[PDB]
């Protein structure tokens, strides 16, 4: 039916990349 478990796990691992970049940008905008 839907996408697999591997694709959801890969998407979460990829979403860690804008999470880290967003943390750096939000801290830079404050700095």
């Amino acid at each position: 039916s839907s996408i697999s478990d591997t694709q959801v796990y890969i998407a979460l691992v990829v979403a860690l990349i804008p999470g880290l970049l967003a943390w750096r940008l939000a801290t830079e905008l404050y700095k």
Partner: protein
């Protein structure tokens, strides 16, 4: 200072709970931050632009991910008319078993929400067919948002912070926006349509696996360079075409057919490809106008300051003084922000007005709740953007305007007669209001007294003429495109109006929203709309033009944009600031979009049932509105839960009551004012300091009542959240309960 908020030493030394609220409400006002220069202002804004843009792309990634992982998109492909789209899944431990049963819908395994944003129709129209394609879209948007997040981090670094000269180079940014961001992006969307969306509509799979192999047209790029461009319009799709299948499928990639596709009841994909190609060429041509590093082009500043018209002296362009208007635009961020919010709000209204009339997504014209939610969504977004446009015009006039650099130009001339403008807006608003309310009350009384033939019913003969000028034969006027003998019909010297047969086929069928038939109820509600627009403009324009000073308060610019009042003296000065005209106008804007969305919904809800006579007979008096639209349509909403059980409309019933509650909570902040609550909180502070064991703990920052401006904020935010959520619950539940 030495404590939060860091950008305000004045707030950081506040000993009360007001410190927290004003720190929140001044966090994005970068100009009022301490130690803020202009270069650091522009650099910080550029970085927040990138971060905001990343928030948008992560949001679109979310849409694709939840449809791919939890929706029914592949099942929705084979039947877009009878399958309900899925937004996402529900995981809520508060649901009882009847609720879990009630939301297990649309052929899903568990409880789900139905999507009403039309993302299935849009993704299906532009060529997506599987859940993996939605997945790769969402992961691509995750990396694309990563790209913008890194760019916003990188342009805060010392080597990569742009200069203040770079930000104020306006001609280069206009050339690049018109040429690239509009023109190349429209050209690339035409490339997508021709390469992917049209072959997928004709049954052919085109992906990243095989697009370099597949030619879109069998004569690929040979007739483009030879100039035989008419080859790409030959063999269009037939009227027997079925979308996503090969039967009835042509080979043309750039047509000029006009009208709607017969099955999907939406615009032709080849017309949309040809559209984006044409305006791509035209926006790229526009993006070569202005002067940059290469010598040729226009200096906009020389165009503003120009004082001779072919050797004849003038005041300026159109004999109008524009000296300093370039610097007024370019040096003020609030002038630019109000101007962009005005243009973007007009574009947002124009999008809403064209997506119901001329739908472009396959099978969305039969999804009624989607059409309703999308119209109402964009009209609400548009009234918010227009209110922000005039709000930033007022902030410009307070903070950034000087009359010395604008001496003698057109903006100073507008300021010189501002009482004439405000008084004439006042006259037009009163003149519309008295007579529109008077005709409504006349019709109400004469229909109440058993004599509905005594109504004042006025045909909208001018807008009916415009519909007859487009080829609508129903009125019988026999004018420009409804007259076959006319020069506008035949296009006499060239006969090249290729669009016209499909256009008249689309406008003369009564089975769509393309120039709906209008009557006296349409007349009365349009004058209600003109009242709403003129009165909202009156409040906004008055508060912009009196922002710097009035006769009641001549030094109003010395207090800023948002301040409570000027005290009890001179009669009393409640709501005197320019921020208060924002506040007063947001009510009129919500009221206005309430009138236009009531009218849209009730006319279309008469359309979708084959009973147009309900709107045509009952919209001329206000009890007909109050009875046949509000009372009658809310029944299946308010039975979303009842003593007998629950169904799938119970969230909309709970949200309907929720929105009433939040709206009514707003009245508390708008009616009760501060000193009542300050005297109350003082006795509470007494009781906490006198109560044993509770004496062990207390506040670090002193409880005070909310400020006057903060109260207007919190009240208006409640009013508008309740307004939106109530109408959303009613709109969605009434349409989705009557039409699935």
């Amino acid at each position: 200072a030495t404590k939060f908020p860091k950008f305000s030493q004045d707030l950081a030394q506040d000993p009360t709970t007001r410190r927290i609220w004003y720190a929140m409400a001044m966090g994005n006002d970068f100009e009022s931050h301490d130690g803020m220069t202009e270069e650091n202002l522009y650099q910080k804004i550029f970085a927040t632009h990138f971060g905001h843009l990343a928030i948008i792309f992560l949001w679109a990634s979310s849409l694709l991910f939840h449809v791919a992982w939890q929706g029914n998109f592949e099942q929705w492909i084979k039947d877009p008319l009878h399958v309900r789209p899925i937004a996402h899944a529900i995981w809520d431990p508060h649901f009882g078993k009847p609720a879990i049963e009630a939301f297990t819908q649309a052929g899903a395994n568990g409880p789900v929400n139905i999507a009403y944003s039309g993302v299935y129709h849009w993704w299906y129209t532009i060529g997506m067919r599987t859940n993996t394609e939605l997945y790769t879209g969402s992961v691509f948007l995750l990396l694309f948002a990563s790209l913008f997040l890194f760019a916003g981090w990188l342009h805060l670094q010392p080597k990569f912070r742009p200069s203040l000269a770079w930000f104020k180079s306006a001609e280069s940014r206009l050339n690049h926006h018109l040429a690239g961001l509009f023109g190349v992006s429209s050209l690339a969307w035409a490339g997508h349509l021709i390469h992917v969306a049209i072959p997928e509509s004709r049954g052919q799979h085109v992906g990243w696996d095989n697009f370099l192999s597949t030619a879109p047209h069998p004569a690929g790029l040979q007739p483009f360079f030879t100039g035989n461009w008419g080859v790409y319009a030959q063999n269009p799709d037939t009227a027997g075409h079925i979308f996503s299948t090969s039967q009835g499928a042509g080979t043309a990639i750039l047509t000029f057919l006009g009208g709607f596709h017969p099955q999907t009841e939406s615009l032709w994909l080849t017309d949309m490809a040809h559209h984006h190609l044409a305006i791509a060429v035209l926006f790229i041509v526009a993006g070569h106008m202005y002067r940059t590093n290469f010598g040729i082009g226009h200096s906009i500043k020389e165009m503003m300051n120009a004082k001779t018209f072919f050797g004849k002296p003038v005041e300026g362009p159109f004999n109008m003084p524009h000296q300093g208007i370039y610097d007024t635009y370019n040096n003020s961020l609030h002038f630019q922000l109000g101007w962009h919010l005005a243009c973007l709000g007009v574009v947002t209204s124009w999008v809403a007005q064209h997506m119901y009339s001329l739908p472009s997504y396959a099978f969305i014209a039969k999804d009624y709740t989607t059409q309703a939610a999308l119209y109402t969504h964009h009209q609400y977004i548009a009234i918010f953007l227009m209110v922000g446009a005039f709000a930033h015009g007022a902030i410009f006039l307070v903070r950034d305007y000087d009359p010395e650099q604008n001496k003698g130009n057109v903006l100073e001339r507008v300021l010189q007669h501002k009482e004439a403008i405000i008084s004439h807006l006042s006259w037009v608003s009163l003149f519309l209001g008295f007579h529109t309310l008077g005709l409504y009350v006349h019709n109400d009384v004469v229909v109440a007294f058993g004599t509905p033939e005594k109504q004042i019913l006025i045909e909208p003969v001018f807008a009916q003429f415009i519909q007859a000028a487009h080829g609508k034969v129903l009125y019988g006027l026999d004018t420009l495109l409804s007259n076959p003998d006319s020069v506008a019909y035949t296009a006499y010297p060239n006969y090249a109006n290729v669009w016209l047969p499909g256009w008249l086929d689309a406008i003369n069928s009564g089975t769509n929203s393309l120039f709906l038939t209008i009557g006296p109820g349409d007349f009365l509600v349009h004058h209600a709309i003109a009242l709403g627009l003129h009165t909202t403009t009156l409040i906004l324009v008055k508060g912009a033009l009196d922002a710097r000073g009035s006769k009641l308060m001549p030094d109003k610019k010395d207090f800023g944009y948002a301040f409570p009042c000027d005290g009890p003296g001179r009669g009393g000065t409640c709501d005197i600031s320019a921020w208060d005209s924002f506040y007063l106008s947001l009510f009129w804007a919500l009221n206005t979009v309430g009138w236009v969305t009531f009218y849209w919904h009730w006319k279309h809800l008469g359309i979708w049932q084959g009973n147009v006579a309900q709107f045509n007979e009952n919209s001329t008096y206000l009890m007909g509105w109050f009875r046949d639209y509000l009372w009658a349509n809310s029944a299946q909403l308010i039975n979303g839960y009842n003593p007998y059980g629950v169904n799938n409309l119970s969230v909309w019933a709970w949200m309907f009551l929720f929105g009433h509650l939040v709206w009514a909570t707003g009245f508390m902040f708008l009616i009760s004012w501060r000193g009542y609550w300050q005297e109350l909180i003082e006795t509470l502070v007494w009781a906490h300091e006198r109560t044993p064991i509770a004496n062990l703990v207390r506040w670090k920052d002193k409880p005070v009542a909310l400020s006057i401006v903060q109260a207007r904020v919190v009240g208006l935010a409640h009013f508008t959240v309740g307004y939106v959520l109530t109408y959303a619950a009613f709109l969605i539940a009434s349409t989705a309960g009557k039409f699935g």
